[PDB]
Design a protein around this nucleic acid. Sequence first.
RNA 1: UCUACCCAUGUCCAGGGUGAAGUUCAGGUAACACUGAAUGGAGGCCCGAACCCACGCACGUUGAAAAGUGCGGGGAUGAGG
RNA 2: AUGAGUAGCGAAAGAGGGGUGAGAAUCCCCUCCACCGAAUGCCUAAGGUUUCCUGAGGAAGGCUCGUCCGCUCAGGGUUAGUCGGGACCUAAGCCGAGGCCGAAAGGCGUAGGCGAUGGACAACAGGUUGAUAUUCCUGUACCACCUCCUCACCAUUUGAGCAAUGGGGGGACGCAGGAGGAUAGGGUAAGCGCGGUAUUGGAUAUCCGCGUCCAAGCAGUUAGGCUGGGAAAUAGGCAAAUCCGUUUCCCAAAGGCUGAGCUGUGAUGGCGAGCGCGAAGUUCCUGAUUCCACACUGCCAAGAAAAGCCUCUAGCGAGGUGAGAGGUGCCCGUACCGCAAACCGACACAGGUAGGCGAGGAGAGAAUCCUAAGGUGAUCGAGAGAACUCUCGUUAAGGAACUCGGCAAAAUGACCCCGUAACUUCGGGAGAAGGGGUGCUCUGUUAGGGUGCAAGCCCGAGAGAGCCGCAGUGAAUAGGCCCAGGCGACUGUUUAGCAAAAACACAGGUCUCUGCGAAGCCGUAAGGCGAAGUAUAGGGGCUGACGCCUGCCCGGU
RNA 3: UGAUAUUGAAUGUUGGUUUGACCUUCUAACCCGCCGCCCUUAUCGGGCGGGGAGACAGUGUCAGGUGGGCAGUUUGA
Lengths: 272, 44, 90
Amino acid sequence: AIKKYKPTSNGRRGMTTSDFAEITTDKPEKSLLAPLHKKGGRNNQGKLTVRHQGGGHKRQYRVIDFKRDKDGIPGRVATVEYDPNRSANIALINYADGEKRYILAPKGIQVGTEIMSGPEADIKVGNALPLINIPVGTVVHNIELKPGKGGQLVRSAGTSAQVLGKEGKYVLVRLNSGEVRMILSACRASIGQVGNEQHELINIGKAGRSRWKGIRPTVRGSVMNPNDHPHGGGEGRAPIGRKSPMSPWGKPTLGFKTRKKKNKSDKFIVRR
Amino acid sequence: MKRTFQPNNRKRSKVHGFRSRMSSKNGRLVLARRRRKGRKVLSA
Amino acid sequence: KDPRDVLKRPVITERSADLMTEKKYTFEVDVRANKTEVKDAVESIFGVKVDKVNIMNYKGKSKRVGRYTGMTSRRRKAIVKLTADSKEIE
RNA sequence: UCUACCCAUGUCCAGGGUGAAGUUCAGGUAACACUGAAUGGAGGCCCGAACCCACGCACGUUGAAAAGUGCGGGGAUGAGG
RNA sequence: AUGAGUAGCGAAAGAGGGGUGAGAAUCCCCUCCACCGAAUGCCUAAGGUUUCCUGAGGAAGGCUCGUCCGCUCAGGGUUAGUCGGGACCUAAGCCGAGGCCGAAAGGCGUAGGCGAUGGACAACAGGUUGAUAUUCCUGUACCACCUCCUCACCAUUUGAGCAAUGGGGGGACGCAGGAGGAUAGGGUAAGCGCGGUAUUGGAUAUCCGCGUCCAAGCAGUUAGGCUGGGAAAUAGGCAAAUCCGUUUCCCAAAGGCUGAGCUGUGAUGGCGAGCGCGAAGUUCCUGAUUCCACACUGCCAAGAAAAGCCUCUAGCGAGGUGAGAGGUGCCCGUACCGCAAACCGACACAGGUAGGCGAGGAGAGAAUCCUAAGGUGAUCGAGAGAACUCUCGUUAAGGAACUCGGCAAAAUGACCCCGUAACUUCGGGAGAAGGGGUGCUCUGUUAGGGUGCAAGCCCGAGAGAGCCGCAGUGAAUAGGCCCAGGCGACUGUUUAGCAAAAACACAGGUCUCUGCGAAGCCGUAAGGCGAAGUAUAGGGGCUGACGCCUGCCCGGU
RNA sequence: UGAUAUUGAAUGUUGGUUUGACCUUCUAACCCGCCGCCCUUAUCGGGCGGGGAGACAGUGUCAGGUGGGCAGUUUGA
């Protein structure tokens, strides 16, 4: 599962990692790789728009079939692989037509396991289906909000979503946020809790490791100057000094629901 | 000590250069100003 | 276009002397021309063959006359190596 | 073209030391646990040159210098230069 | 003008003899001496733009002089199919037809194209002038292309052959560690050659000095490294398929890709001590920071693209393929400086300036001291040797009484052996502290190891005897240590140019937001970061490792 | 946040005089950083076909609230 390093040094002290036991290999498929270049939080305009990003180890994108458009084609798992671009792991699978793809990595999955993605398929792990053919009481991921678009949902590691019922064209679904939602029924989804399941259970141990992950430091606003942040200023270390904690851009943070009120998906959602 | 001016003719010609000034409106206006005065060296 | 317009004039130095002893002559040329042009120019003018050509181009020396500090014109000098079994030149 | 940050691609870090994880052996245990060696070679690890930075002093303070020099100093395979 | 002929004349060893010249500390030559030597040496960028070389000159500049030059005048000097860059590739980024937005201007952005700091790519070894040279000359080669030609083969419609701007492969990749192999290089250890055997006492050999090589390409070979192969069938590889990929069968070492280097050639030449000529030109040892090579192993933070190349068919296909012979091969740059007096610092400025090579002894070492190769003697001097200032060295007895304060300085310092505490997150503390020993000779070419076929070269623990000194890491360099406390867990970052910190950050913790066209943020908007991510994620706030904990109040905001 | 224009077709409902308002529903408007095909070797857009949402949203005009996020200013003798 995880490793717990010994305290040979104050930086290595407290550190934990994964054993990467689930992994099988150390090299991906060139056919499915693609390039990246970091962005440092900057935009088209060059201006910085998001903080706390930039300067990590470089990476190379692993293309993914979040759609499972292929149907009636039995695939077979070949490998499990590391993707730096995500909490989860991935699985390289090979279809009978010679095509090869990556997918997300559920838990309890092994090499040699076979896969089908079409509606008539079975409801075991790794397979993919529309929510109609999927029954109630199932654990699901890479859920898609629109048919053909691919999963824009539970993809992350250790995550899972439960199914609850139907309304015909729409389907009730629980989400890892704890949230209930109506989703169009023809939209596909893939079965099984996502694999890694312990990514959260890590002590990064030091700062350099987050820098390697590409996270730049975070400066608190209570030490900035008032030109820069509201909390900034004050002779000596000082408290907030106003009605609420506030953002650098003059908005509150705690409790202030940011979602739009006139939004339309409010119809489809139920609770949270 | 290290100082401000570290010459690179490429950077000079790609910033303060003729193609660049002619690229933009405001750079054209320079050349206008920089002619009716009568400057021999109107740009890099 | 004409070879007569290609070539401009020779270069008379002790270097050029030493070289015409060794059958390879020199010239100076319009700045745009090239090696093959000058080769065919020589062949067409003097009726002589060529072993090879080696070509150069110098910048303009700055000068001074009173306050005035202009620059000399540029130059494109070209060394040509006649074959053996080839003619010489005046 | 300084400088702050970022992006892409390159490049530099004399030597020496410590000795982790893991593996094997032996003791040990019902099994383990645990213990001792060998291998192993980690580390924002150690000492310390290049390199980088600037704490302590002195000097200079119409200077060699519009921010330095000298003697020491800190980091020196990582948040590196 | 004064200040005042005052300050300063910008780190650093020079002296003498000759010469030149109207005129010499300052220019040239010689001899000695001294400095550098992981640099003050060789290459080379950016940048400078003639400063290069030669010959004249000394009005200015040179912090003086000047017969001199990075100054002034004249002249001259930079030679490329293979080097670097273009007629090749693309990243970041930039431009951007059409288009999308926008009071205008313009912004965004597709196709497409620019764009190296990377990829790919054919030539080396010797001379050469005052100045260029893997560019010129001499030798030997290689790459691409062309056919007036020669040869061999194949075929003209199943018609041999060619290779898509398409597909596939490959290019194509991190970081660390360590063994191996080889080589540059080094040693002079042998052996060889050349020269000398000297005058200060001594030495014919048991001596001294100097030198003891040669590519690219071609043929062969290899340490090794990788890679499992063969036969059929194919829901895919935007059209197709003998190529890919997938599956099933038969074999299990062979095969292929590679491969540093090595041997012969190249070499009936060149180089070469030394004197236009020219001897020996081998072996042994050591041995990389370099190559095999990111090859292997391990690790996680999971390590560019495209084109060259190969292949597939599609398509073109009536003359082609191969070899030889002959022939063609453009543009830019090439001088010179490049830790410097030519660059950036207003200066001939004690500063800064990327990268490659980088010797010997002692040495772990690019440290350090002294020296090689090679380069310098530094742009004012001589002369007295006082107060004072600076940088240094010694010091009686005392020993921190000085002092805000042991600031500064001194002291310690290397290697080996013994020994090493409270405490602890059990890892450390710890080089704790503290003690002790180091030199030379003989046993001894040692016990022993590496190499070697052996001889013969390298490394060299330990003890025994002995010898000297005040003193044996005899010089330079290389911890001062301990007790306790506060603050911050730590490594790190910061007020360039007063403040390095208890400040910032940090990993960790917690709260909150956000269901994906997220949220937030930039922008008038389009368009974007977020994210080619999806609540084990992203953003914001506060707190700051770890351990024990984090109590009462929701009245007010 | 509301009114109004884009923004129309219905079934009901309740009001006073047909009318407007309200709830449901539909689609053709509008929208889609959903799919497929062509433009086209194109992750732009733009045409077709579907699909999803839907007279909502978005946008324009008007109005109220909040609003040191920002600006101009005052803060006596």
